[PDB]
Amino acid sequence: HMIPINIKDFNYSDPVNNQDIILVKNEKGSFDKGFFVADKILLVPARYGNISTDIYLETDSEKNEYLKNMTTLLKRMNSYSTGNKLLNLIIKGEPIYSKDLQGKFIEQTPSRYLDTNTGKRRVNVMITGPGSNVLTKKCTHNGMGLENDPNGKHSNGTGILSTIEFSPNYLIAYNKCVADPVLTLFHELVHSMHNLYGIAFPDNVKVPYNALKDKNLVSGEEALSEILTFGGKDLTTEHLETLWKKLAETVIIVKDFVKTDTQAKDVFLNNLRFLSKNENIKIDTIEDIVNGTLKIKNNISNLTECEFCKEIGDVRIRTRYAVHSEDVTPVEVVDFKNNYKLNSGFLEGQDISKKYFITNPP
Ligand SMILES: [Zn+2]
Numbered sequence: 001h002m003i004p005i006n007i008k009d010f011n012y013s014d015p016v017n018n019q020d021i022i023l024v025k026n027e028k029g030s031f032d033k034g035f036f037v038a039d040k041i042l043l044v045p046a047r048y049g050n051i052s053t054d055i056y057l058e059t060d061s062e063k064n065e066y067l068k069n070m071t072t073l074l075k076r077m078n079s080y081s082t083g084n085k086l087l088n089l090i091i092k093g094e095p096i097y098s099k100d101l102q103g104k105f106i107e108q109t110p111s112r113y114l115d116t117n118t119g120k121r122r123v124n125v126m127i128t129g130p131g132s133n134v135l136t137k138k139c140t141h142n143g144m145g146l147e148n149d150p151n152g153k154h155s156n157g158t159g160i161l162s163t164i165e166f167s168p169n170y171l172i173a174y175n176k177c178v179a180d181p182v183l184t185l186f187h188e189l190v191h192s193m194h195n196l197y198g199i200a201f202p203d204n205v206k207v208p209y210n211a212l213k214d215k216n217l218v219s220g221e222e223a224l225s226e227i228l229t230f231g232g233k234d235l236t237t238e239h240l241e242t243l244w245k246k247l248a249e250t251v252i253i254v255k256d257f258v259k260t261d262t263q264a265k266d267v268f269l270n271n272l273r274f275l276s277k278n279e280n281i282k283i284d285t286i287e288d289i290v291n292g293t294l295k296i297k298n299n300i301s302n303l304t305e306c307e308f309c310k311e312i313g314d315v316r317i318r319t320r321y322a323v324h325s326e327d328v329t330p331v332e333v334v335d336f337k338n339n340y341k342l343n344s345g346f347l348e349g350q351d352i353s354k355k356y357f358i359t360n361p362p
Pocket of ligand 1: 187191226229
């Protein structure tokens with residue numbers, strides 16, 4: 001059942017050691033302290049990009065709080081089968097090597113490595129603070145999103161590390177119900193998992209009509225991976241068959257790419273073993289691929305925000321992924337560390353009227 005993951009506790013003041021406490025080279029060429037809370041999962045208490053607006057996360061005390069609060073979310077997530085399973089995939093995944101102009105494979109690539117003050121370090125996901133908007137929660141690869149990058153490494157089976165922007169102190173309420181940040185963080189990590197294995201498919205699919213959104217039986221469309229990430233009623237058995245199909249196509253394509261190199265091929269096969277939960281997965285024949293990717297679809301079909309929510313049991317999630325922006329209310333969490341707990345979540349629940357939520361923050 002549960003695969004042990006050691007999620008490490010740090011204080012922001014803990015010295016850089018070049019092992020689990022490092023300095024990440026940022027876009028401006030300065031350095032932010034990074035903490036490997038787990039293998040290949042780097043937590044960076046800093047703002048993302050150049051901030052000139054809302055200053056949050058500049059002080060040591062705020063950096064320490066961010067570190068503690070995000071670690072609480074990760075430990076909570078890891079307490080549940082769904083969360084633990086997701087984090088394992090993220091830890092164990094390996095983006096495929098790239099080919100140079102000679103057709104030779106190279107292992108040390110920007111898809112696999114971040115720059116640090118001591119040089120290149122292997123990262124699968126970097127979790128860091130938001131940009132200029134403190135509310136931003138987003139999973140990027142190479143500075144780009146799910147639908148931003150046609151034929152990107154996030155969607156072509158080769159895979160790429162992600163950066164997640166996320167603040168646990170500034171949140172959104174849907175119809176007076178503040179989204180639980182463990183659910184939102186799980187959401188973003190599902191995106192990072194898809195990116196890591198190069199299975200973040202952008203393909204538009206139709207979603208069920210929503211009476212309190214659509215009109216005159218005109219349904220909406222959304223990206224397949226988005227519907228998969230959220231899950232619930234919006235995700236249909238047909239969506240999942242589209243996913244199975246896309247997976248099989250991807251494996252066929254990637255097989256052809258790595259066929260020239262044993263090491264590169266072995267990495268791919270390792271990935272397939274983790275995704276499929278089958279040590280004996282093969283890609284020798286079309287049939288092997290179809291069977292293998294079926295196991296992959298089944299295995300990742302339960303890694304959805306709705307499934308995670310269900311498993312927690314005592315937290316609320318909105319019914320549909322699609323929201324109209326008239327239902328949304330920003331909030332600030334007061335004294336997160338005392339009001340949101342590892343085993344409990346929000347101590348008095350997610351209603352916006354609770355004292356530890358400030359509506360329409362400064
Ligand atoms: Zn999403």
